[PDB]
Amino acid sequence: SNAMVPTHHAGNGFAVASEQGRICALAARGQRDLRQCVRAYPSLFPNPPVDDTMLSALALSTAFIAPWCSAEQLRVANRASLWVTAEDWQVDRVATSDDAVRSIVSACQAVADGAAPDVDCALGQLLAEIRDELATGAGFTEWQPVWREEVRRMLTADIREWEWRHSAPPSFAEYLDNADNYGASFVNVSHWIVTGDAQTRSHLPELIAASREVQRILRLSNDLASYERDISGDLNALLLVDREEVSRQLRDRIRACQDHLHALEVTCPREALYLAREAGFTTGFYHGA
Amino acid sequence: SNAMVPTHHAGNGFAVASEQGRICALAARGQRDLRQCVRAYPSLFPNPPVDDTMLSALALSTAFIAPWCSAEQLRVANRASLWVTAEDWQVDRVATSDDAVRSIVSACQAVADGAAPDVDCALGQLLAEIRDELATGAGFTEWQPVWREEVRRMLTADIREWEWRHSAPPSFAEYLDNADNYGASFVNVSHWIVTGDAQTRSHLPELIAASREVQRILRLSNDLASYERDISGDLNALLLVDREEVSRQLRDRIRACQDHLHALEVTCPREALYLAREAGFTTGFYHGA
């Protein structure tokens, strides 16, 4: 216990710190496509909320989840990420009628199915850009239905959240089943489409199941520290169950997802490690101990 | 070689990624004193160069070098860091006469010796703030001469660099002996003054020697990637020796400093690990592979 603790730690610290410095350099390289993206569509990203610190947090999350990736290879994942936020802020706020939310949802689903976006809709044109980036960068064929279905799940979950917001509240379990609106699996599938190979497509079903698991862990981790922020009038998991239940839930789900990823990295080592780093970085950054 | 490579990596990845996410959260907490500091003395920090991305890079370096520290405990080290940059930019540019550099140097040395700063000099008042922060936060007595001497070494090195800039150029070895102007040991000593205890003061001589070693490694790592930037008219180590010599030099010096820190962490584990993480993060971030 005492002499059993290692007695030299500098060597290792340098190594780890050097990897961390390289990853922050990678994240800094990742920010220029974020600025360009925002540039082209300032209609979607207001500066008041979206400062360079927001883009930097997003870029560091992206780089640390998949540190083996080029900044170019992380361009899809970043922009998709951006888009999710953009999408949320035109349903979380800019929408007012039960009508606009549905029309935004139908428009983005139509764009995700290859149709052109209308001239006025910046969200649709950013998604068209992401779709074309996938089309020319996809590492395997027949990626379209998978990505289309991820878009569909996300939009469906988002309007179910809208409905609950404006309605006389779901149970904790229904709320957790609606995590697709968090957008993590949309981003993960968009990333795997450009960074994966045919064997990645081979294993896509199991990978998406594990991604939904990670996404539930992410929703709980997020709300656990978003309580006062939404306290916004938005939904949050502490209103369904108190902090002891959500905390123990996050703990158990983390252990279970790690067992599943431990089994899965035999079939898919890169993608399972990517999911583990996603869950890891996000829970750690959210907690902030 | 093949079956000898480990066959499970997700568990560990989560753990590491979670530590990295926590450290980025810590760095984000560290940025508010940076903004306040800049606030009080915009006379010293122009926005064109100093954007939130600069403060974020500095904050992440600070947090990753000493991740065991509170954001409060990293306030000294951050501001000192800021000050160094500030100091450099009023000798690197705002000075014109052989006279102003010397007067700035004398003024900051006087402030570091307890004297009040003049009403017009923002650099001197920021250093007075840092000095008072040390005075009320010092973890041991008789810190003043050590910090005063670090200030003296830094300012002396800075005007020797000014002289060389405006003169008909040193050899590589003299340039490397002048690394105190990089400011790493000033920052390290300022940090150890508020985070250390009496045993830290006990071991201060060896710790400062190791800090100067790390600082030389940092100067080489910095110039290796600052070549085109200074190409500014400033001095850089690739003009004295070509890239093969500087690279092999960085390699050998890194190995030697790690052997020394491996010996030293027996006497001082936290401070040696701090130096190892400093060298680590900085070389990795500079290289940017």
Both tokens of A50, joined, read 């979206």
Answer for the pair A207, A192: CB distance below 8 angstroms, yes or no: yes
Please name which of B127, B144, B102 lies closest in space to residue B41, comparing C-alpha atoms: B127
Query: Which residues 10-29 of chain A have a CB within 8 Å of chain B?
Result: 10-11, 13-26, 28-29
Q: What share of chain B is helix, strand, coil (3-state, %, to 5)?
A: 70, 0, 30
- Min distance B89 CA to chain A CA atoms (Å): 23
A211 touches chain B (CB under 8 A): no
Q: How was this structure determined?
A: X-ray
Answer for the pair A129, A76: CB distance below 8 angstroms, yes or no: no
Resolution (A): 2.5
Helices B10-40 and A10-40, axial angle in degrees (round to 10): 70
State how far the Cα of B195 lies from the Cα of B134, in Å rounded to an integer: 10
Please name which of A278, A271, A150 lies closest in space to residue A200, comparing C-alpha atoms: A271
CA trace torsion B161, B165, B167, B170 (10° rounding): 60
State how far the Cα of B213 lies from the Cα of B204, in Å rounded to an integer: 14
Which CATH architecture fits B9-287?
A: Orthogonal Bundle (1.10)
Residue A10 has its nearest CB partner, among B31, B60, B261, at B261
Instruction: Count, in order, helices (H) and strands (E) of chain B.
Output: 12, 0
Please name which of A158, A161, A150 lies closest in space to residue A184, comparing C-alpha atoms: A150
- Min distance A265 CA to chain B CA atoms (Å): 7
**Residue A31 CA from chain centroid, whole number:** 17
State how far the Cα of B183 lies from the Cα of A95, in Å rounded to an integer: 52
Residue A273 has its nearest CB partner, among B9, B258, B275, at B9
Residue B225: DSSP 8-state: T
* CB contact burial B249-282 (16+ within 10 A = b; e otherwise): bbeebbeebbebbeebbeebebbbbbbbbbbbbb
| CB-CB under 8 Å, B258 with A13 | no
Long-range contacts of B158-163 (CB under 8 A, 24+ apart): B158/B87, B158/B88, B158/B91, B158/B101, B158/B105, B159/B91, B159/B101, B159/B102, B159/B105, B161/B235, B162/B91, B162/B95, B162/B98, B162/B101
| Residue ranges covered by each domain of chain A | 9-287
- Which residues 6+ apart lie within 8 Å of A13 measured at CB? B273, B276, B277, B280
Residue B18 has its nearest CB partner, among A17, A51, A283, at A283
Q: What is the CA radius of gyration of chain B?
A: 19
